[PDB]
Structure 1
Amino acid sequence: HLYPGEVCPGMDIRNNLTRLHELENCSVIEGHLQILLMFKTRPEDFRDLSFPKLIMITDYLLLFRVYGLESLKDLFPNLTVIRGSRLFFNYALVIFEMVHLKELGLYNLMNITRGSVRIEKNNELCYLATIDWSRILDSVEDNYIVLNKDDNEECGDVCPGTNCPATVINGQFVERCWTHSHCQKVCPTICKSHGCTAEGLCCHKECLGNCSEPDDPTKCVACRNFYLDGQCVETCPPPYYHFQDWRCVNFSFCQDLHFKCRNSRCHQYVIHNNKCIPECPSGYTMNSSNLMCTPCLGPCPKVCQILEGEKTIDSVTSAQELRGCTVINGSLIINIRGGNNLAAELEANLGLIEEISGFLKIRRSYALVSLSFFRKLHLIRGETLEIGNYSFYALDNQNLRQLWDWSKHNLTITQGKLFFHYNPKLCLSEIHKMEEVSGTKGRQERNDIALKTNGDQASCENELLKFSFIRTSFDKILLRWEPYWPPDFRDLLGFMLFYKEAPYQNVTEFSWTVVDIDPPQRSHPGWLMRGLKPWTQYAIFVKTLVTFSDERRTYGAKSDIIYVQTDATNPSVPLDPISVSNSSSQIILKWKPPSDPNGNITHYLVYWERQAEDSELFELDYCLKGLKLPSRCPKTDSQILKELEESSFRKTFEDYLHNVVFVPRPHRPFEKVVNKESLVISGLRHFTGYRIELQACNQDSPDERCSVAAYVSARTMPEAKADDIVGPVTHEIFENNVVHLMWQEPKEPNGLIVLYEVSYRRYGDEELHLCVSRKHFALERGCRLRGLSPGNYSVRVRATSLAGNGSWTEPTYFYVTDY
């Protein structure tokens, strides 16, 4: 059921297992557990030790260089909850340099309430890709798991498949198992956080992780909100006060703790807002008799004496030590060398402070984007200043964009100078607004706020250029914008025009093809584009190019990004057009959509035409030998400085000349295809070639705008009996035993007829064959024979076409005179 045993506040284990045995009689850890610095150990030393009583840890679990430990499935076989009340460098579970360790084996951990997990430098660790952290951590992107065996090598992972559930992580499913014999337990989505039983039923609402019997507060292993007398409750009822955000205690416990802290060396506990907390917040003071902090009749802030007067903030746990502070008796150095935005936690812990006795310094915060998390920061006294008498030292902030919201936020800097350097995404406008609002306008000297380093990678020209005339055509775009001139017009070096295709709308500022334009003379500047890709939406905006100036704020001019789409045109020829002759009168067409649609393909055009048979074949005697009838980029870095220097030299010479000179005295069948990539043509002559003219054409009613067609040759299949000769064979015998054979030709054969075969044989003799070609057939009206021996003969007739050889006719009997 619920937690038995004592509470065993968090402890530390070092150099031997002798002090590790004190975890046997407790199930909940009210603190942080660290097992670390274990060198004189062996793998057999751990198999004899196991702690199944442990259930959940309030703060975190840290493992650092514990030799001989291979898996945690025996040490902590019932751990399920890591609350993360106090973290270890914004990490709730750290596994660092765990040599001789192969797998985690924490097969009962379900939810980590707060924090993240960092696992690093374990050359023998596997089963890291076989675990789903999304089911446990709210923010899975905050994990940092590198330098293991799963990336430097290819160690095998064997999740039992014959049962481990598979879950998609990026785009594919894979089984989730803690070890080779422990599938990762997964609950149904209806059981969002309360957990499921063995058969998968949602537990009680006040339940978390796992439960014995569903829908029962008293049959759970981890109370989600609070624990009290073996029962999980929404809040502690009276007279019980919330304690450590995880359990409810009476007044006696808090009183005993407070008295013991007073009567010893500390967390002198008090009571406020129905909770026993160590120190009550600003404006309250604990009474003598009772422990409740009555509000004070005056402005008493909660001071936080910073040791050494200079505290470095680099992690969630380091920022948490300032929780509830209002007056900071020292200086803050904000330095998060991260890569993930910790703004939420920073605003949760900080932001309740009002004044800083010393200075504020923000250095190398790669992840910071805005200092708005200082919600209630107003005064910076600057009694202790950074070296060089500085009260706000911002340096090398890679992604800092805004300091505050000056429309609402107020600030006050008493003493000390400003400092800004290498904030590439922070613009000078914000810095000057801060100078004006704070009241430190006349305090900074030259080079205190750098100009060539701040905002160099931010597009904040704060001056608008408006396009006055934009025109679009087939493949070129004509642009025009209003002229711009700095106070010294010779400073204008021209314009930069940036264009890039934009399939979607939201496009960033500042690929991105660069073209230069000469400045105008003294007729808007304008520019004409060359060779655009038709039917495409582009992004256009003009950025000025002007000489740098050291004396003051530099200059500025740029145009807001616009979107323009070039028109449509004729599409390309359809790709891969093929034809198959499935039937004797049917042809099927297949083709692909054009590679360059150049718009929207509204329809297709298919054209049909018959090609007459080759008259050359009709005029050949194919009975001769040889009758094999056919069977059918950027810009150099030095160059730009070169033209800058040349222009500056010209300006300098002009200025010198003016100084020296002036002195101040005192038809074919077809059809229309509608969104079909294939076609079937009917009503075609058998075994006849057809040429297919195929067009992809994207405009029908307002005239066709579409290019040339694809030409292919398709020949229909031949009829089976087209070459079969119809009509009885007629034989004629003259006085001199001269035989002439007559028959009716196949008037509609597969294409044409080249020759005929006549085979005449006497009864019992050998078969004699004869060929009659087209010219012979026309001249003799069939077959003519000379000098026949007496007897009974059988004559067989067949035809030859382009398809092949025709069937023979029924033999006919005839006999000649013997004289």
Structure 2
Amino acid sequence: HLYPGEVCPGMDIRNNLTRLHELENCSVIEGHLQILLMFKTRPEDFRDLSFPKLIMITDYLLLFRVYGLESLKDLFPNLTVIRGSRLFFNYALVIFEMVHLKELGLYNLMNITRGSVRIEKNNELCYLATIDWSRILDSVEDNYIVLNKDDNEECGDVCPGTNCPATVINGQFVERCWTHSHCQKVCPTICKSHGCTAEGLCCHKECLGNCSEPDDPTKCVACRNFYLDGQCVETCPPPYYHFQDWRCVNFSFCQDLHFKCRNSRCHQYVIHNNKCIPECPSGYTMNSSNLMCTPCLGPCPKVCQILEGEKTIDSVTSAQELRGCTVINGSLIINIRGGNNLAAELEANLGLIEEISGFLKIRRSYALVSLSFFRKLHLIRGETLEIGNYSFYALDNQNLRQLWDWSKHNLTITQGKLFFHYNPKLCLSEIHKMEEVSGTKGRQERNDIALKTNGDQASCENELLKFSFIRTSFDKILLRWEPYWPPDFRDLLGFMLFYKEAPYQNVTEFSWTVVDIDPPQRSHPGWLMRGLKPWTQYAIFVKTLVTFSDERRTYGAKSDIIYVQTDATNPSVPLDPISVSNSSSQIILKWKPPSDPNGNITHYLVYWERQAEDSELFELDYCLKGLKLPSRCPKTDSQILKELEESSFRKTFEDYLHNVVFVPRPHRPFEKVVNKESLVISGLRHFTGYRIELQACNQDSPDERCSVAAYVSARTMPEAKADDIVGPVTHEIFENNVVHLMWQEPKEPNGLIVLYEVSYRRYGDEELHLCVSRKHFALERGCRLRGLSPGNYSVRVRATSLAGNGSWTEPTYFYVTDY
């Protein structure tokens, strides 16, 4: 159930396992736990050592170079909550340089309330990618898990699937398991943070992590808000006071803690706002008999004496030592060598201070985007200045954009000069505004505020260029902006045009194809766009190119990013035209839409034409041998320096000349396709070739504006009995026993018939064949037999067309006279 036994305040264990045996009788650690620096240790020194009683840790857990430890599943088999009240360099779980460690094994870790997890330099640690930290820690983007065995090698991670839950991480579902035999317990979304039981039932509203029986505060394992009498409560009822943000205590316990410090060497506890806090905040003073903080009859701030008069803020834990401070009796150095935005936890610890007796220095703060976390910073006395007599030292801040919101924020620097160098995203406008507000305008000397490094990567030209004449064509865009001239019009070396296609409106500022535009002659400067793609929206804005000025402000002018879309036109040719004739009169034609729509495609045009049969087939003798009828580079850097130098040299010569000279004396079938890519075609002749003309056309009513077609050919299937001969077989016998055979031709064949074959066989004799071609059939009106032996024959006739061979006609019997 809840926490039994002792409380074992924060402890550190080193150099052996001898002193760790004092964690046996306590379940919750009221502080931080550190197991580190164990070299004379062996893997057999941890099997018999286990701490099932430990449940929750308040500050953090640190593990640094403990040899022989392979898994935490035995040391802490029931650790479930790390509150993270006090972090170790903005981290709540640090595992650093754990040699011989192979798996985490913290299979009960459910919630990490505050902080992050860092795992680094563990050459044998695996089962790291199989942990869903999003279910454990809220802000998972701040975790730093690098240089392990999960990426250096390919160590296997076997989560039993025949039960470990699978959750999506990036784009795939993977099973979650701490070890080879323990699955990461995942609760349903109905149990937000209170946890679930074995059967998946939500615990009490005041619960956290795990519980024995659902919907019962007294059967939980880790309290979400506070602990009291084995029960989790939202707030401490009277006469109990909050203590360490995790449990409720009476006045006697806090008094004993206070007296144990007063009568000894410390955190002399007091009472304020129904809490037993270490030090009373600003504006209150502890009394003699009672410990409750009465408000003072005077504005007494909380001074925080910084040792050595210089404090470096580099993490959440360093800033937290200034929590509740109002006046700082020292100097602050803000250096977050990071990559994750800590302003959320920085404004909670800082931002309550008003005065700084020394200097404020912000150096190499990569992650900071603004100094707005100083909510109440008003006075910088500068009684102790940075070397070189500086009271505000900003340097090498790669993402600093805003110093303060000067509309409502007041600032007053008493002494010391300013310094701003290598702030690529902090512009001179903010610096000068802060100079005016602070009152140190006439205090800085040259090169204290840099010019080629402050804001060199930020667009703050603070002057608007207005486009004056824009119109678009097929593949060109015409641009015209109002002319711009600095006071020295020769300083304008020309304009620079940035363009980029954008499907949607909101586009970033500052790809980005560049073209250099000369200044006009003193006619708007303008420029003509070329090499565009039709029906595409582009982002356009112009940024001036002025010569640098070391003395005064350099200069600035730029235009808002306008969006222009070029017009539509005829699309491309439809792709992949394929035609298939599944039936004797039906053809299915399939195609792909053109790759260049150049607008919205509205309709398609398909044309057909029956191909006339080749003339030579009607005038070829195919009974002869040989009768095989077919069965149908950015501008390099030194270069631009050359134009810069030449343009400056021309002005230098002009100025020298002017100074010297002047002395101041004293029809075919078709159809319309609607949003379809195929068609079934009716009314087609059987076994005939067709020519298809296919177009994709995006405009019908206001005249068609569309391109050339795609051509393809297809042949329909033939009929069954098209080639078969119909009609009775008619024969004539002359005086000289000449047999003249006649038969009705197949009026409607599959295209055309090339030849006929007649098979006459006298009874008992062998079959005789004779080919009759088109010309023979026309000349003889069928067949003519000369010189035949007496007897009775059997005559069968077949017709051969383009489709193939037709069926033979019924046998016919004729008898020639014997004489």
Same fold at TM > 0.5? yes
Q: Distance in 1 between matches of 2:163 and 2:11?
A: 38
> Which whole-Å deviations, capped at 9, do the CAs of 1:457-476 have from their partners, x for residues lacking one?
01110111100110011110
Q: Determine the structure 2 residue equivalent to 1:280.
A: 280
Give the Å deviation of 1:99. Answer: 0.9
Q: Which one is further off, 564-573 or 153-162?
A: 153-162
> Which whole-Å deviations, capped at 9, do the CAs of 1:47-104 have from their partners, x for residues lacking one?
1111111111001111111111111111111111010000000001011111111111
Q: Distance in 2 between matches of 1:766 and 1:469?
A: 97
Q: Distance in 2 between matches of 1:46 and 1:399?
A: 47
Segments of structure 1 that go 5 or more residues without pairing to the other structure are none
Give the Å deviation of 1:813. Answer: 1.2
> Which whole-Å deviations, capped at 9, do the CAs of 1:440-468 have from their partners, x for residues lacking one?
00000111100011111011101111001
Q: Determine if the alignment matches structure 1 residue 79 to structure 2 residue 79.
A: yes
2:221 is paired with a residue of what secondary structure?
Answer: coil
Give the Å deviation of 1:689. Answer: 1.0
Q: Determine the structure 1 residue equivalent to 2:113.
A: 113
> Which whole-Å deviations, capped at 9, do the CAs of 1:151-192 have from their partners, x for residues lacking one?
111111111010111111111111111111111111111111
Q: Determine the structure 2 residue equivalent to 1:795.
A: 795
Give the Å deviation of 1:647. Answer: 1.4
1:19 is paired with a residue of what secondary structure?
Answer: helix
Give the Å deviation of 1:508. Answer: 1.3
1:272 is paired with a residue of what secondary structure?
Answer: coil
Q: Determine the structure 2 residue equivalent to 1:707.
A: 707
Displaced runs of 4+ in structure 1, greater than 4 A? none
Q: Distance in 2 between matches of 1:363 and 1:714?
A: 77
Give the Å deviation of 1:720. Answer: 1.8
Give the Å deviation of 1:362. Answer: 0.2
Q: Distance in 1 between matches of 2:134 and 2:361?
A: 36
Q: Distance in 2 between matches of 1:93 and 1:442?
A: 50
> Which whole-Å deviations, capped at 9, do the CAs of 1:215-239 have from their partners, x for residues lacking one?
1101110111111101111100000
> Which whole-Å deviations, capped at 9, do the CAs of 1:264-303 have from their partners, x for residues lacking one?
1100000000000010100000000001111110111111
Q: Determine the structure 2 residue equivalent to 1:541.
A: 541
Q: Determine the structure 2 residue equivalent to 1:739.
A: 739
Q: Determine the structure 2 residue equivalent to 1:451.
A: 451
Q: Distance in 1 between matches of 2:432 and 2:608?
A: 76
Q: Distance in 2 between matches of 1:137 and 1:118?
A: 12
Q: Determine the structure 1 residue equivalent to 2:503.
A: 503
Q: Which one is further off, 762-771 or 403-412?
A: 762-771
Q: Distance in 1 between matches of 2:99 and 2:721?
A: 85
Q: Determine the structure 1 residue equivalent to 2:167.
A: 167
1:182 is paired with a residue of what secondary structure?
Answer: coil
Q: TM-score, normalised by structure 2?
A: 0.99
Q: TM-score, normalised by structure 1?
A: 0.99
Q: Distance in 1 between matches of 2:341 and 2:751?
A: 80
Q: Distance in 1 between matches of 2:387 and 2:598?
A: 65
> Which whole-Å deviations, capped at 9, do the CAs of 1:15-46 have from their partners, x for residues lacking one?
11111111111111111010101111111111
Structure 2 matches for 1:116-515, cutoff 5 A?
Answer: 116-515=116-515
Q: Distance in 1 between matches of 2:657 and 2:745?
A: 108
Give the Å deviation of 1:706. Answer: 0.7
Q: Distance in 1 between matches of 2:162 and 2:750?
A: 64
Alignment length (residue pairs) = 819
Cα RMSD, aligned residues only: 0.8
Give the Å deviation of 1:195. Answer: 0.7
2:755 is paired with a residue of what secondary structure?
Answer: strand
> Which whole-Å deviations, capped at 9, do the CAs of 1:658-699 have from their partners, x for residues lacking one?
111111121111111111112111221111111111111111
Q: Distance in 2 between matches of 1:682 and 1:174?
A: 55
Q: Distance in 1 between matches of 2:622 and 2:532?
A: 60
> Which whole-Å deviations, capped at 9, do the CAs of 1:240-262 have from their partners, x for residues lacking one?
10111111000000000000011
Give the Å deviation of 1:809. Answer: 1.2
Give the Å deviation of 1:726. Answer: 1.2
> Which whole-Å deviations, capped at 9, do the CAs of 1:385-423 have from their partners, x for residues lacking one?
100000000000000001000000000000000000000
> Which whole-Å deviations, capped at 9, do the CAs of 1:346-391 have from their partners, x for residues lacking one?
0000000010111000000000000010000000110111000000
2:578 is paired with a residue of what secondary structure?
Answer: strand
1:115 is paired with a residue of what secondary structure?
Answer: coil
Q: Which one is further off, 703-712 or 662-671?
A: 662-671
Give the Å deviation of 1:518. Answer: 1.2
Q: Distance in 2 between matches of 1:636 and 1:191?
A: 59
Q: Distance in 1 between matches of 2:688 and 2:55?
A: 86
Give the Å deviation of 1:654. Answer: 1.2
Q: Which one is further off, 77-86 or 797-806?
A: 797-806
1:418 is paired with a residue of what secondary structure?
Answer: strand
Give the Å deviation of 1:605. Answer: 1.1
Give the Å deviation of 1:434. Answer: 0.5
Give the Å deviation of 1:200. Answer: 0.6
Q: Which one is further off, 245-254 or 601-610?
A: 601-610
1:503 is paired with a residue of what secondary structure?
Answer: coil
Q: Distance in 2 between matches of 1:702 and 1:178?
A: 68
Q: Distance in 2 between matches of 1:210 and 1:502?
A: 51
Structure 2 matches for 1:628-643, cutoff 5 A?
Answer: 628-643=628-643
Give the Å deviation of 1:701. Answer: 1.3
1:209 is paired with a residue of what secondary structure?
Answer: strand
Give the Å deviation of 1:311. Answer: 0.3
2:796 is paired with a residue of what secondary structure?
Answer: strand
Structure 2 matches for 1:3-152, cutoff 5 A?
Answer: 3-152=3-152
1:275 is paired with a residue of what secondary structure?
Answer: coil
Q: Which one is further off, 578-587 or 340-349?
A: 578-587
Q: Distance in 2 between matches of 1:398 and 1:350?
A: 21
Q: Distance in 2 between matches of 1:338 and 1:720?
A: 83
Q: Distance in 2 between matches of 1:147 and 1:751?
A: 78
Give the Å deviation of 1:579. Answer: 1.1
Q: Distance in 2 between matches of 1:729 and 1:177?
A: 90
Give the Å deviation of 1:531. Answer: 2.0
Q: Distance in 2 between matches of 1:732 and 1:448?
A: 126
Q: Distance in 2 between matches of 1:245 and 1:25?
A: 22
Q: Distance in 1 between matches of 2:662 and 2:44?
A: 98
Q: Distance in 2 between matches of 1:677 and 1:60?
A: 65
Give the Å deviation of 1:633. Answer: 2.1
Give the Å deviation of 1:108. Answer: 0.8
Q: Distance in 2 between matches of 1:282 and 1:592?
A: 76
Q: Which one is further off, 409-418 or 728-737?
A: 728-737
Q: Distance in 1 between matches of 2:737 and 2:743?
A: 19
Q: Determine if the alignment matches structure 1 residue 654 to structure 2 residue 671.
A: no
> Which whole-Å deviations, capped at 9, do the CAs of 1:573-623 have from their partners, x for residues lacking one?
111111111111111111111100000111111111111111111110000
Q: Distance in 1 between matches of 2:488 and 2:23?
A: 79
Q: Determine the structure 1 residue equivalent to 2:816.
A: 816
1:371 is paired with a residue of what secondary structure?
Answer: coil
Q: Distance in 2 between matches of 1:249 and 1:661?
A: 92
Q: Distance in 1 between matches of 2:292 and 2:636?
A: 72
Q: Distance in 2 between matches of 1:625 and 1:26?
A: 110
Q: Distance in 2 between matches of 1:155 and 1:725?
A: 80
Q: Distance in 1 between matches of 2:627 and 2:566?
A: 61
> Which whole-Å deviations, capped at 9, do the CAs of 1:503-539 have from their partners, x for residues lacking one?
1211111111100111111111111111211000001
Give the Å deviation of 1:730. Answer: 1.1
2:499 is paired with a residue of what secondary structure?
Answer: strand
1:429 is paired with a residue of what secondary structure?
Answer: helix
Q: Distance in 1 between matches of 2:662 and 2:353?
A: 62
1:608 is paired with a residue of what secondary structure?
Answer: strand
Q: Distance in 1 between matches of 2:680 and 2:223?
A: 71
Q: Distance in 1 between matches of 2:216 and 2:80?
A: 18
1:495 is paired with a residue of what secondary structure?
Answer: strand
2:656 is paired with a residue of what secondary structure?
Answer: helix
